[PDB]
RNA sequence: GUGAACAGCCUCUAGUUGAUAGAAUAAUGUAGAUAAGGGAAGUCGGCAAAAUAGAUCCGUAACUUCGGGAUAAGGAUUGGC
RNA sequence: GCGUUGGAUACCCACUAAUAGGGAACGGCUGGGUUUAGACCGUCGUGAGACAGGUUAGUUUUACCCUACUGAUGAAUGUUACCGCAAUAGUAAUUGAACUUAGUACGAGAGGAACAGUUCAUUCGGAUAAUUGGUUUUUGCGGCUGUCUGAUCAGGCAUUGCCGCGAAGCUACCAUCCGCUGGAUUAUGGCUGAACGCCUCUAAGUCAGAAUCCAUGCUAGAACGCGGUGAUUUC
RNA sequence: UGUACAACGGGGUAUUGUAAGCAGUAGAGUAGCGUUACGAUCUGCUGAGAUUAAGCCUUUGUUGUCUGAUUUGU
């Protein structure tokens, strides 16, 4: 039993999900969804479709190179079973996942800084450019306050 | 091919059935009975804990309603001649 | 399951009814195989016999060597384009339908098989697994 | 006159399965009932004790 | 003259007539044979079909091609909160068959089971069993006499139980009440068990256990009026045939001058009573287990409920039964689980199930994640999260 | 689902993939082998006039020249420029075999890339000379 | 307007908004579509559908009354800026 | 009891456990045929025409009636509600392969079983939608052509405009699951035993034994078969 | 007259594929005086925006509703 990643969008492929295509050169293409399978059959570029992890990594929407991302790789050289080593691995997986989530959050925040400054500049320009609507707003507020007073 | 009603196959099935399958069934029944008794005992204990805070002849008719209804029904059947056992 | 097969066979979705044409995956000189019969097929009115991966069929060579043509020979299906379910938990399919020429004992006429070979067929036929270079 | 008529739950009041809502017939009968009530009032009868003691429909040409 | 080509008939003549079932709860027609030496036990249980999901099984089946291998199998989930024992019925044997002699009820009945006796609960004065409850006063005369009558004369003992439908996500508030045969010791012991269990609950793991073959009795999903082609599986007529092609071309061509009862005709499809047998229990999950959806191979802490809940049903917050394969009925229908009528002689009844993984992805779409935490970890940080 | 997409991208009507075409173009020996093919009667133009990028045979040299003077061939050449998107790309995008994917990208940038570009330039000038 | 075009589709002027209606969406129909893998194995019979199709370029056989066959066949292309 | 096929043009080819014969016609669609008017060739006839013949083209269009059959309501025997019984009627499973027995019995050899214990599949049947696939008026999301609303935005029409994806529902040997066990027998093999001082399976009696019969199990539930149980009206 | 019901709203769960608007120095070039103007497209704010029961799940919020008609007795 093993979780696979989709060839097109890198989403997890749990047992009994998606479909696999085998090419003449023995290459297995596993797709989590009929959507990804049909996109592959139509020969679209996953690095051009914005909803794929390939596009996100290529465009820098999420972090791609990190020390937390080197703990998972295919082990072609097996190791003898050890109960304490298994317990240590199980604890380490949770710790690494927590650290990776924190680092991804920091990466997103660093990417999205500046939005508040841009929004404030846009709001200032709109307020400076619309005087008549502000006068209507002031009249409405004053009439509402007079209604509340009386 | 031998049918589901084939005598030799059914005899072999009975020979198999009197052994390990019946042993497994009996063991499962004993375990289920033990769990049922434990479930009853746990319910009794919880009811007792909840109440801690708060603190034969079968002859004749069943009841008067049954007597009245059955007498009326038999009289109705006798009057209408719709009785199964009595003329 | 046919003479020469190694054990029982679980059901695979049928993709090749009678009249289908598949490629020839061995090196005996045949190019394609035209299915005229399916070994081990059942009997039902109006229903065409159909073969899946790992089945033995009776086929005639349409393209290839003229010595191989105009004859009926046993073949074993090694690839199919119709998707089928594996018990490990995925549906899968190949690019094309492909078979190899064999004998009634399940022994290959050719010496090697080009392209991938299905796991089910390789496990069911020892000679296919012996002549396969790629097994899934 | 109820061959090949649909079935409704509103017929269970009268113990039937086939009932309808003939609007034109109901309006004509309502007009005649109103006229009969007016005639009874003109005669001076008690309106609360009146019941339809006879009603008859015949085929006109 | 003879038909030129032989073919089997379309459909089963033993499942006639194909009419709608008389009730939404299917009747149990046969209970397991009573062995007087065994301890007292219920012969059946009641539950609600919640939905289906997928498992991975580490199969141990000697002689099989999938011995020591993993198999992906479909399962059915039945929500089974504990039933409540509220009555007992005695049956005597007559030359005309079994006859119910007497029925004894418990002192207190909940409104959930009282609603079963009403068509208009909100307008009613809720007077059910009010005078009956007065018979328990001053040493329970009458109640004791009827229990003694059951002990003296009855040859079959059944217990009246009802479901706790208020624990399910269902919008229906009216509970389901049914008779379950008591198989076990003597008649007196059965009566004593019923009297002691009055107003008490019975859980599903005190009736069934894992690796057991059971039977599912239920009414199938209805489909209304259906033609012969999909009702009986008949072959379609050629294209643009006059008077339709989804028909049987000739319903009679011979002497009897009638339509035979064995000829396919259009009519009701579905909503029929069915009793399917030999469904293996893959898991008896407890409602208080925080990881009843986890295994020894899958260490993720999760419940049996899929993401977004079961479609059209909801979440599973009670004890549940996971059996392999499919059972008759659709989701949220009441089903009866019955003990096997015979000792099964197949090795599958002796096989022990060890699940490696249970699917909990969303059934409302092409679900790719097992938990919302997994979905969040895969997607990352969104606009609204910052 | 729709008829056009079904009858174009049916399984039996599949075409050669971009990564395989990239591997064909990478080595000079493979380019020479595809340029010098045995005369096959089952291929258009006796197996001659074969565009490697589009993996397409032409019946005539003028047909090949007109295909080269076309936007479809330019689209294929534009597609064949970057990384061919093997399974390692999706694995590293999911967070799997990241070092292997980075090493593959570095090898493509250093060794495979410029040699493939030079082979493409040589093929282009050879087609221009022979056409 | 698009387009070779009194074609098809949309619009201005002008002119209509007429044809018993309302509520549900079973089977069977009438009219119109889609379909995995195989591809005529169906049927007396490829009936019916599907496939093709505009324009530009390359190229086009037997036969022939030398006028044709011919758009024979078989290939490549088409947007926007 | 249960099956008895797929094709080619009465015979062949193949698959298969097998491709047995026949009756309810020969006492609904559909091709050959009764095919009337058109036409051509052949034979005969002085001719109108006929035929030893051969070819081609050629309108007949119910059901809403009664019954039968399939499904669906329903008055009345105090009212109403819940839980049940089972007369009767129907009934269902089928075939092949594989491991082991075993390269064992048997056999100069060449070859070569079965019972007991296990695993799959064919045909049929009943379900089911977790997964895969099909389907799209979810007109859900996006895109494209032409035109129209001054342009952007947002939209109309193109008798579902077209294209891609598409949940939900429905659905597929294109998907998955499930489909049993007691009595009595047939042919036959016997026991005791006369007829008949031998003998004898039969005469009296009696033991086993078929995919057979009747039951178990499954479906319906007599709307004029039945039982147990709850409540039973303040103008 | 309430783990009451309904209409909205909120949170999940799914479908699609990155909204309107603003900006850039990215943009084949062309015109005028390195700059400006036009410019398919590209990039950022933006897995954004839109839809989500009509037969999906859940709900410490808002607003309302709880009512008419007929009949039945041993
Ligand atoms: Mg046929
Ligand atoms: Mg009508
Ligand atoms: Mg779903
Ligand atoms: Mg198709
Ligand atoms: Mg044919
Ligand atoms: Mg035929
Ligand atoms: Mg010609
Ligand atoms: Mg004529
Ligand atoms: Mg019977
Ligand atoms: Mg045996
Ligand atoms: Mg079916
Ligand atoms: Mg438009
Ligand atoms: Mg003797
Ligand atoms: Mg009855
Ligand atoms: Zn994917
Ligand atoms: Zn090219």
Short mmCIF file of N, CA, C and O in Angstrom, two decimals, chain E residues 310-383:
data_model
loop_
_atom_site.label_atom_id
_atom_site.label_comp_id
_atom_site.label_asym_id
_atom_site.label_seq_id
_atom_site.Cartn_x
_atom_site.Cartn_y
_atom_site.Cartn_z
N UNK E 310 -21.45 11.68 5.20
CA UNK E 310 -22.06 10.83 4.19
C UNK E 310 -23.08 11.64 3.40
O UNK E 310 -23.85 12.41 3.97
N UNK E 311 -23.07 11.47 2.08
CA UNK E 311 -23.98 12.23 1.23
C UNK E 311 -25.40 11.76 1.49
O UNK E 311 -25.69 10.56 1.49
N UNK E 312 -26.29 12.72 1.76
CA UNK E 312 -27.71 12.56 2.08
C UNK E 312 -27.97 11.90 3.43
O UNK E 312 -29.13 11.69 3.78
N UNK E 313 -26.94 11.57 4.21
CA UNK E 313 -27.15 10.98 5.53
C UNK E 313 -26.59 11.85 6.65
O UNK E 313 -27.34 12.25 7.54
N UNK E 314 -25.30 12.15 6.63
CA UNK E 314 -24.69 12.89 7.72
C UNK E 314 -23.49 12.20 8.34
O UNK E 314 -22.81 11.41 7.68
N UNK E 315 -23.23 12.48 9.61
CA UNK E 315 -22.08 11.94 10.31
C UNK E 315 -22.45 10.66 11.07
O UNK E 315 -23.62 10.36 11.30
N UNK E 316 -21.43 9.90 11.45
CA UNK E 316 -21.59 8.69 12.25
C UNK E 316 -21.05 8.99 13.64
O UNK E 316 -19.84 9.18 13.82
N UNK E 317 -21.94 9.01 14.63
CA UNK E 317 -21.58 9.34 16.00
C UNK E 317 -21.97 8.24 16.98
O UNK E 317 -21.89 8.44 18.19
N UNK E 318 -22.38 7.08 16.48
CA UNK E 318 -22.78 5.94 17.30
C UNK E 318 -21.95 4.72 16.90
O UNK E 318 -21.03 4.81 16.08
N UNK E 319 -22.27 3.58 17.50
CA UNK E 319 -21.68 2.32 17.05
C UNK E 319 -22.13 2.01 15.63
O UNK E 319 -23.24 2.37 15.21
N UNK E 320 -21.26 1.36 14.88
CA UNK E 320 -21.55 1.05 13.49
C UNK E 320 -21.04 -0.34 13.13
O UNK E 320 -20.14 -0.89 13.77
N UNK E 321 -21.63 -0.89 12.08
CA UNK E 321 -21.24 -2.17 11.51
C UNK E 321 -20.76 -1.92 10.09
O UNK E 321 -21.49 -1.35 9.27
N UNK E 322 -19.53 -2.33 9.80
CA UNK E 322 -18.95 -2.28 8.46
C UNK E 322 -18.90 -3.70 7.93
O UNK E 322 -18.14 -4.54 8.44
N UNK E 323 -19.71 -3.97 6.91
CA UNK E 323 -19.72 -5.25 6.20
C UNK E 323 -19.22 -5.02 4.79
O UNK E 323 -19.39 -3.94 4.21
N UNK E 324 -18.58 -6.04 4.23
CA UNK E 324 -18.08 -5.94 2.87
C UNK E 324 -19.23 -6.07 1.87
O UNK E 324 -20.30 -6.60 2.18
N UNK E 325 -18.99 -5.56 0.67
CA UNK E 325 -19.99 -5.62 -0.37
C UNK E 325 -21.14 -4.66 -0.14
O UNK E 325 -21.04 -3.68 0.61
N UNK E 326 -22.26 -4.95 -0.80
CA UNK E 326 -23.43 -4.10 -0.79
C UNK E 326 -24.62 -4.87 -0.22
O UNK E 326 -24.68 -6.10 -0.28
N UNK E 327 -25.58 -4.12 0.32
CA UNK E 327 -26.79 -4.70 0.90
C UNK E 327 -27.99 -4.02 0.25
O UNK E 327 -27.88 -2.90 -0.27
N UNK E 328 -29.15 -4.69 0.22
CA UNK E 328 -30.34 -4.07 -0.36
C UNK E 328 -30.76 -2.82 0.41
O UNK E 328 -30.53 -2.69 1.61
N UNK E 329 -31.37 -1.90 -0.32
CA UNK E 329 -31.81 -0.63 0.23
C UNK E 329 -30.86 0.51 -0.12
O UNK E 329 -29.72 0.31 -0.52
N UNK E 330 -31.37 1.72 0.03
CA UNK E 330 -30.59 2.93 -0.19
C UNK E 330 -30.18 3.52 1.15
O UNK E 330 -30.46 2.96 2.21
N UNK E 331 -29.51 4.66 1.10
CA UNK E 331 -29.05 5.31 2.32
C UNK E 331 -30.23 5.78 3.16
O UNK E 331 -31.29 6.12 2.64
N UNK E 332 -30.03 5.74 4.48
CA UNK E 332 -30.95 6.16 5.55
C UNK E 332 -32.18 5.26 5.68
O UNK E 332 -33.07 5.55 6.50
N UNK E 333 -32.23 4.15 4.96
CA UNK E 333 -33.31 3.18 5.15
C UNK E 333 -33.00 2.25 6.32
O UNK E 333 -31.84 1.90 6.58
N UNK E 334 -34.06 1.86 7.03
CA UNK E 334 -33.95 0.92 8.14
C UNK E 334 -33.70 -0.48 7.59
O UNK E 334 -34.38 -0.93 6.66
N UNK E 335 -32.72 -1.17 8.16
CA UNK E 335 -32.34 -2.51 7.74
C UNK E 335 -32.31 -3.42 8.96
O UNK E 335 -32.04 -2.97 10.08
N UNK E 336 -32.58 -4.70 8.73
CA UNK E 336 -32.52 -5.71 9.78
C UNK E 336 -31.32 -6.61 9.52
O UNK E 336 -31.16 -7.13 8.41
N UNK E 337 -30.49 -6.79 10.53
CA UNK E 337 -29.33 -7.68 10.47
C UNK E 337 -29.67 -8.95 11.23
O UNK E 337 -29.95 -8.90 12.43
N UNK E 338 -29.62 -10.09 10.54
CA UNK E 338 -30.05 -11.36 11.10
C UNK E 338 -28.87 -12.32 11.21
O UNK E 338 -27.97 -12.32 10.36
N UNK E 339 -28.89 -13.13 12.26
CA UNK E 339 -27.93 -14.21 12.41
C UNK E 339 -28.14 -15.25 11.31
O UNK E 339 -29.24 -15.42 10.78
N UNK E 340 -27.06 -15.95 10.97
CA UNK E 340 -27.11 -16.99 9.95
C UNK E 340 -27.99 -18.15 10.40
O UNK E 340 -27.93 -18.58 11.56
N UNK E 341 -28.80 -18.66 9.48
CA UNK E 341 -29.69 -19.77 9.77
C UNK E 341 -28.98 -21.12 9.80
O UNK E 341 -29.60 -22.11 10.20
N UNK E 342 -27.72 -21.18 9.40
CA UNK E 342 -26.97 -22.43 9.37
C UNK E 342 -25.51 -22.14 9.68
O UNK E 342 -25.05 -21.01 9.55
N UNK E 343 -24.80 -23.18 10.09
CA UNK E 343 -23.36 -23.09 10.32
C UNK E 343 -22.65 -23.13 8.97
O UNK E 343 -22.63 -24.18 8.32
N UNK E 344 -22.09 -22.00 8.56
CA UNK E 344 -21.47 -21.91 7.24
C UNK E 344 -20.20 -22.76 7.19
O UNK E 344 -19.38 -22.74 8.10
N UNK E 345 -20.06 -23.52 6.10
CA UNK E 345 -18.96 -24.46 5.93
C UNK E 345 -17.88 -23.94 4.98
O UNK E 345 -16.97 -24.70 4.62
N UNK E 346 -17.96 -22.68 4.56
CA UNK E 346 -16.93 -22.09 3.72
C UNK E 346 -15.84 -21.48 4.59
O UNK E 346 -16.09 -21.02 5.70
N UNK E 347 -14.61 -21.49 4.06
CA UNK E 347 -13.47 -20.97 4.80
C UNK E 347 -13.52 -19.47 5.00
O UNK E 347 -12.84 -18.95 5.89
N UNK E 348 -14.32 -18.76 4.19
CA UNK E 348 -14.48 -17.32 4.38
C UNK E 348 -15.12 -16.99 5.72
O UNK E 348 -14.83 -15.94 6.30
N UNK E 349 -15.98 -17.87 6.23
CA UNK E 349 -16.55 -17.68 7.56
C UNK E 349 -15.50 -17.83 8.65
O UNK E 349 -15.67 -17.25 9.74
N UNK E 350 -14.43 -18.58 8.41
CA UNK E 350 -13.35 -18.74 9.37
C UNK E 350 -12.21 -17.75 9.16
O UNK E 350 -11.34 -17.65 10.02
N UNK E 351 -12.20 -17.04 8.04
CA UNK E 351 -11.18 -16.02 7.80
C UNK E 351 -11.30 -14.89 8.82
O UNK E 351 -12.39 -14.54 9.26
N UNK E 352 -10.15 -14.33 9.19
CA UNK E 352 -10.08 -13.21 10.12
C UNK E 352 -9.66 -11.96 9.37
O UNK E 352 -8.64 -11.96 8.68
N UNK E 353 -10.44 -10.89 9.51
CA UNK E 353 -10.25 -9.68 8.73
C UNK E 353 -9.27 -8.76 9.45
O UNK E 353 -9.43 -8.49 10.65
N UNK E 354 -8.25 -8.30 8.73
CA UNK E 354 -7.33 -7.28 9.22
C UNK E 354 -7.28 -6.17 8.19
O UNK E 354 -6.66 -6.33 7.13
N UNK E 355 -7.94 -5.06 8.48
CA UNK E 355 -7.94 -3.91 7.59
C UNK E 355 -6.62 -3.15 7.71
O UNK E 355 -6.07 -3.01 8.80
N UNK E 356 -6.12 -2.67 6.57
CA UNK E 356 -4.94 -1.82 6.56
C UNK E 356 -5.27 -0.34 6.47
O UNK E 356 -4.50 0.49 6.97
N UNK E 357 -6.40 0.02 5.86
CA UNK E 357 -6.74 1.41 5.63
C UNK E 357 -8.22 1.51 5.31
O UNK E 357 -8.78 0.64 4.64
N UNK E 358 -8.85 2.58 5.79
CA UNK E 358 -10.26 2.88 5.52
C UNK E 358 -10.33 4.24 4.85
O UNK E 358 -9.75 5.21 5.34
N UNK E 359 -11.03 4.30 3.72
CA UNK E 359 -11.16 5.55 2.98
C UNK E 359 -12.14 6.49 3.68
O UNK E 359 -13.25 6.09 4.04
N UNK E 360 -11.72 7.74 3.86
CA UNK E 360 -12.58 8.77 4.42
C UNK E 360 -12.60 10.03 3.56
O UNK E 360 -12.92 11.11 4.05
N UNK E 361 -12.25 9.91 2.28
CA UNK E 361 -12.33 11.04 1.37
C UNK E 361 -13.79 11.39 1.10
O UNK E 361 -14.71 10.60 1.33
N UNK E 362 -14.00 12.61 0.60
CA UNK E 362 -15.35 13.10 0.37
C UNK E 362 -16.03 12.30 -0.74
O UNK E 362 -15.44 12.03 -1.78
N UNK E 363 -17.28 11.92 -0.49
CA UNK E 363 -18.11 11.27 -1.50
C UNK E 363 -18.98 12.26 -2.25
O UNK E 363 -19.76 11.85 -3.12
N UNK E 364 -18.88 13.55 -1.94
CA UNK E 364 -19.60 14.60 -2.64
C UNK E 364 -18.87 15.06 -3.90
O UNK E 364 -19.35 15.97 -4.58
N UNK E 365 -17.74 14.45 -4.21
CA UNK E 365 -17.01 14.77 -5.42
C UNK E 365 -15.87 13.80 -5.61
O UNK E 365 -15.90 12.68 -5.10
N UNK E 366 -14.86 14.24 -6.36
CA UNK E 366 -13.63 13.47 -6.52
C UNK E 366 -12.70 13.83 -5.37
O UNK E 366 -11.73 14.58 -5.51
N UNK E 367 -13.01 13.28 -4.19
CA UNK E 367 -12.25 13.60 -3.00
C UNK E 367 -10.83 13.05 -3.06
O UNK E 367 -10.62 11.88 -3.39
N UNK E 368 -9.86 13.90 -2.75
CA UNK E 368 -8.45 13.53 -2.76
C UNK E 368 -7.82 13.52 -1.38
O UNK E 368 -6.70 13.01 -1.24
N UNK E 369 -8.48 14.06 -0.37
CA UNK E 369 -7.92 14.20 0.96
C UNK E 369 -8.75 13.41 1.96
O UNK E 369 -9.97 13.31 1.82
N UNK E 370 -8.07 12.83 2.95
CA UNK E 370 -8.76 12.06 3.98
C UNK E 370 -9.23 12.93 5.14
O UNK E 370 -10.27 12.64 5.73
N UNK E 371 -8.48 13.98 5.47
CA UNK E 371 -8.82 14.86 6.57
C UNK E 371 -8.76 16.31 6.13
O UNK E 371 -8.02 16.66 5.19
N UNK E 372 -9.53 17.19 6.77
CA UNK E 372 -9.38 18.63 6.51
C UNK E 372 -7.98 19.15 6.83
O UNK E 372 -7.51 20.08 6.17
N UNK E 373 -7.31 18.57 7.83
CA UNK E 373 -5.93 18.94 8.11
C UNK E 373 -5.02 18.58 6.94
O UNK E 373 -4.12 19.35 6.58
N UNK E 374 -5.23 17.40 6.34
CA UNK E 374 -4.46 17.02 5.16
C UNK E 374 -4.73 17.96 3.99
O UNK E 374 -3.81 18.34 3.26
N UNK E 375 -6.00 18.34 3.80
CA UNK E 375 -6.34 19.28 2.74
C UNK E 375 -5.65 20.63 2.95
O UNK E 375 -5.08 21.20 2.01
N UNK E 376 -5.68 21.14 4.19
CA UNK E 376 -5.02 22.40 4.50
C UNK E 376 -3.51 22.30 4.31
O UNK E 376 -2.88 23.23 3.79
N UNK E 377 -2.91 21.19 4.74
CA UNK E 377 -1.47 21.03 4.61
C UNK E 377 -1.04 20.94 3.15
O UNK E 377 0.03 21.43 2.78
N UNK E 378 -1.85 20.29 2.31
CA UNK E 378 -1.51 20.21 0.89
C UNK E 378 -1.68 21.56 0.21
O UNK E 378 -0.80 22.00 -0.55
N UNK E 379 -2.80 22.25 0.45
CA UNK E 379 -3.06 23.49 -0.27
C UNK E 379 -2.15 24.62 0.20
O UNK E 379 -1.66 25.41 -0.62
N UNK E 380 -1.90 24.71 1.50
CA UNK E 380 -1.08 25.78 2.03
C UNK E 380 -1.91 26.89 2.65
O UNK E 380 -2.97 26.64 3.22
N UNK E 381 -1.43 28.13 2.53
CA UNK E 381 -2.10 29.28 3.11
C UNK E 381 -2.93 29.98 2.05
O UNK E 381 -2.43 30.28 0.96
N UNK E 382 -4.20 30.24 2.36
CA UNK E 382 -5.12 30.90 1.45
C UNK E 382 -5.20 32.39 1.74
O UNK E 382 -4.62 32.89 2.71
N UNK E 383 -5.93 33.10 0.88
CA UNK E 383 -6.09 34.54 1.04
C UNK E 383 -6.84 34.89 2.33
O UNK E 383 -6.44 35.80 3.05
#
